[PDB]
Write a structure and sequence with these properties.
This is part of a larger assembly, with chains A (119 residues), B (114 residues), C (56 residues), D (139 residues) and E (47 residues). By secondary structure, chain B is mostly helical. Chain B has one domain. Chain B is built from five helices and no strands. Chain C is rod-shaped and about 60 Å long. Chain C is α+β, with helices and mostly antiparallel strands. Chain D is of the alpha+beta class and 139 residues long. A two-stranded antiparallel sheet of chain D has the order 1-5. In chain D, strands 2-6 form a two-stranded antiparallel ribbon. Classes of the chains: A alpha+beta (119), B mainly alpha (114), C alpha+beta (56), D alpha+beta (139), E mainly alpha (47). Chains in contact: A-C, A-D, C-D. The structure holds five RNA strands. Chain E: InterPro entries: Ribosomal_bL34, Ribosomal_bL34_CS. Chain E: Keywords: Ribonucleoprotein, Ribosomal protein. Chain E: Belongs to the bacterial ribosomal protein bL34 family. Chain E: GO terms for molecular function: structural constituent of ribosome.
Chain lengths: 119, 114, 56, 139, 47
RNA sequence: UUGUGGUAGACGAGCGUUGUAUUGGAGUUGAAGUCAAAGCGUGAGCAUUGGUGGAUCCAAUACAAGUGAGAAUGCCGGCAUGAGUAACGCUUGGGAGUGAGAAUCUCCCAAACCGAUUGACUAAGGUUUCCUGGACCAGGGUCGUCCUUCCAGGGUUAGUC
RNA sequence: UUCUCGCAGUCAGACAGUGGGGGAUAAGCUUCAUUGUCAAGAGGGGAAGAGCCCAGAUCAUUAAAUAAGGUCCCCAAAAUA
RNA sequence: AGGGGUGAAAUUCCAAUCGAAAUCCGUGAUAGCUGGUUCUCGUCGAAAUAGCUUUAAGGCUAGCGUGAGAUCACAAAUAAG
RNA sequence: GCGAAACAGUACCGUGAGGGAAAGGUGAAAAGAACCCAGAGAUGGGAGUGAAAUAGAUUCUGAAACCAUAUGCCUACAACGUGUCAGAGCACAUUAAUGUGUGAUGGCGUGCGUUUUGAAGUAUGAGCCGGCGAGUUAUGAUAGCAAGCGUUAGUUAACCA
RNA sequence: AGUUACUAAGGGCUUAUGGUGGAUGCCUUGGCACUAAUAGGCGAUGAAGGACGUGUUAACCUGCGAUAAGCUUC
């Protein structure tokens, strides 16, 4: 039909992915949808393996991929990732984050998942 | 003074609905549907109560004729063997039931020999 | 389109005989006793004993 | 050995509870709650608390265990059906029909009571036979 | 297209008020018919 | 024996039921009714027994028929099938909390960003929907612990406009 | 069965054999008089078949024998040359 | 303000509708017009034919359907020299 | 029965004249299940009163369609208005009844009424249940049947009792 | 190789149990329909009919009237 709720558009999807990866960088773990949780884990692993240099170049590049949240904004998440998250898990080839399956949702029985940061 | 008539109406409607209980589908649980099915069943029963007479009569004819075709004749010839000699009132139903009996129809079919 | 004749109540029941879900999996948790689902977390907060969830 | 508890028309889908009844029927309440609480159907979230009464009643009323029972038979009732309006074309205003259900569940301890409905089936006529032979000498 | 029934009870009162309905034989006949009907509404002030 | 196939058509003789005129009787000993089953007539119909009834009823004779239910593209006491199908109506995500239960309700930032205005204003209309406390029961096109939902309590202040 | 009377209904019928016509002696078109049928007549046959054949069924009969029809089977009853 | 008003013309608009809205009674009008009408057995059992209709979806009469009654078989009558 | 047994013209539609609703029952006496129990909430259990809680408030009767399950049997091999006549096997035994529930399987097997020359009807109204719902009466006449007085015979209107 | 299936997801058949339902049956709180009589209306001296308010009553429907769910003489 014509004009209605937009829903999960490509721009909205990428903005939501950025918000979720910023949230998992700030709060550490995120309880979300499994399909979103896996994409968030992928982006978090990419960010961890990208931030091991800790230079302004990665700052500018990741500036296009983080969306500020309640606790951390873009340039504070920059320092957070460049300081503690990325170097803590660089000791291993991959596996910078782990996604585990949870139960359904109350009202809509949506299969959820939890994403945590670990080596 | 009002005559309710509901009691008679309820009794008759319940009777019509219940008499058709026993068939597949919702035919057990209706009045118009149940009555149409009862009409069909009554038509079949009325046609049958006259037709099954000849139906099982011809069943006897066919059952006898099979044995006669195994006896060396046919039913037309067997009544030709009931016309030229030894006309018996032992009936086509009863000569058929004699086959269920041990060596009873054989005596009849050997008696009708010309 | 639309139906001409109604699908029977028994026809409806026979049609709805396969709307139910498929069978599920079962998993024994070694530390906290529960018969959970496969590659899922139990009510005790652990996927296969990895403490990855709270008590609730 | 019943300790039943009538629900009296909670607003919930009956066709979404018949599906889980068709499985839970014939199983013991010891492993019936487990098989009923592992379904994604949220429609039962307003039902599971009611059963908590019965066992508790069995705890205090008679002293029964409340876990040696089995679900003998459901009733998927069609109680008071409510109607609300739907936004439709040309103001046709189709009616959304909330079908209710007065769900009562029988939890019988022994593996019997499946044949006790049959006992009642035969007794409904055996009792009139008794009453008739009582009056058959007085026709 | 403008929606019908834009309510404004000033015109409603000036139209179907009591003093306008109690000024001719037909109006009083209508008022008597409504009174005998035990109508919940006599004029527009109580719909 | 003939028709008893039967419209139309008209001929003859009947059956039930509410109630009434009666002979009447039964009853918490189980009344009507309802639910159930393995009788009698030529048919309307009569039935007989048992539980539900915790109180009125029944049936032959005749009468008032507001009497006998298949359509009158019926009437209302209610809902099936169509079907878990079509929709769920100008965007949601996370951290924590409320709560027995949270994408759902709330603090926060995100998301979107309209910004001749996703901001307020008073008029007509709404007459409390304003706010506080409680609940989410009826409803939120899902849940919703929340609501502009409900309940309880309170509030709107002119001489000048 | 005419009549007094209650008097209908009918006042749109359809066909078949003979005298037929309108038409292509075509039409599930049509029309009368004599034989009848369906309406309002079922059933057997015609594989189903309102009007055709046998035929007029009141019910019961998993009744005897006949009629059209069928008789290699589905399909009742034909064997033999 | 109603078989009216009204109209840059369209049957346009009058409480999203108007060759004239809704609305109160005669009126349950009428229809030679459709559809249906709740229990049963059964005497006999049609017809859609002739004329007429400002008549053809209808009705009238005579028959056909039928009973109460008259004639009580030579009767209305049917048939073979 | 009045629309109104009922917070019955209440509420409500429309601005408006006007229109215009539906539905009752515990028991006996609340003797309202004290008490305990679960339970955000519903509501229900036991015990106890209560003869009886199908009288515990889902409280007079508490039907059917519709919504579910189940003894026994059958059904995942069927061209079929879903059945009639037969009849396997199994479990079953009464309104003392030519038996109860099936129907594996065979022969047969295209709803009711109308329009009507004639409809499973590929013409139709018809999802279903339940109740209501249409041949009466009055007046003049006609006929079928019966009655009184009774062949210058009966008979009332008004009026009086 | 020919065989029916317990199979059975589920359904059908008689019945039982449970639910909207209060139809049917009993009764009414309630109307309906009559009986003949006093008599044949009120009121600008403030009428009928309403709004508003009022409670030993908290309000609901209603009664009444600032004397305000009322009141006085005998």
């Amino acid at each position: 039909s014509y004009i209605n709720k937009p829903g999960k558009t490509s721009a909205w999807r990428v903005m939501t992915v950025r918000q979720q990866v910023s949230a998992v960088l700030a709060y550490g773990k995120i309880e979300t949808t499994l399909k979103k949780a896996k994409n968030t884990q992928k982006r978090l692993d990419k960010l961890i393996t990208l931030a091991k240099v800790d230079n302004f170049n990665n700052r500018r590049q990741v500036k296009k991929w983080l969306l500020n949240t309640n606790l951390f904004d873009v340039d504070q998440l920059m320092d957070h990732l460049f300081s503690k998250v990325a170097p803590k898990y660089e000791k291993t080839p991959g596996g910078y984050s782990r996604v585990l399956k949870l139960g359904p949702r109350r009202g809509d029985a949506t299969e959820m998942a939890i994403l945590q940061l670990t080596d | 003074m009002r005559i309710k008539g509901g009691k008679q109406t309820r009794v008759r409607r319940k009777k019509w609905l219940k008499q058709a209980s026993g068939s597949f589908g919702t035919r057990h649980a209706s009045y118009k549907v149940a009555k149409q099915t009862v009409i069909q069943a009554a038509k079949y029963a009325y046609r049958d109560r006259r037709n099954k007479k000849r139906d099982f009569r011809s069943l006897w004819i066919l059952r006898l004729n099979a044995a006669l075709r195994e006896q060396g004749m046919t039913y037309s010839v067997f009544i030709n063997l009931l016309k030229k000699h030894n006309i018996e009132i032992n009936r086509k139903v009863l000569s058929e039931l004699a086959i269920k009996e041990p060596s009873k129809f054989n005596l009849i079919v050997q008696k009708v020999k010309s | 389109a639309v139906q001409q004749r109604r699908s029977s109540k028994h026809r409806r029941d026979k049609r709805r005989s396969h709307d139910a879900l498929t069978a599920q999996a079962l998993s024994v948790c070694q530390k906290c006793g529960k018969k959970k689902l496969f590659h899922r977390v139990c009510s005790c907060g652990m996927y296969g004993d990895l403490r990855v969830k709270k008590a609730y | 050995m019943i300790a039943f508890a009538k629900q009296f028309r909670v607003r919930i889908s009956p066709q979404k509870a018949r599906l889980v009844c068709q499985l839970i029927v014939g199983k013991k309440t010891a492993d019936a709650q487990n098989i009923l609480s592992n379904t994604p159907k949220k429609a039962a979230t307003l039902i599971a608390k009611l059963l908590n009464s019965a066992i508790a009643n069995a705890t205090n009323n008679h002293g029964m265990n409340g876990d040696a029972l089995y679900v003998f038979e459901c009733v998927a009732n069609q109680g008071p059906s409510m109607k609300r309006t739907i936004p439709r074309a040309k103001g046709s205003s189709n009616m959304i029909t909330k079908r209710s259900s007065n769900l009562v569940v029988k939890l019988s301890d022994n593996p019997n009571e499946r044949q006790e409905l049959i006992k009642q089936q035969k007794a409904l006529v055996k009792k009139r036979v008794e009453g008739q032979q009582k009056a058959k000498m007085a026709r | 297209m403008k929606r019908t029934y834009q309510p404004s009870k000033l015109k409603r009162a000036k139209t179907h008020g009591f003093l306008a309905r109690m000024a001719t034989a037909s109006g009083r006949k209508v008022l008597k018919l409504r009174r005998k009907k035990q109508r919940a509404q006599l004029t527009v002030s109580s719909e």
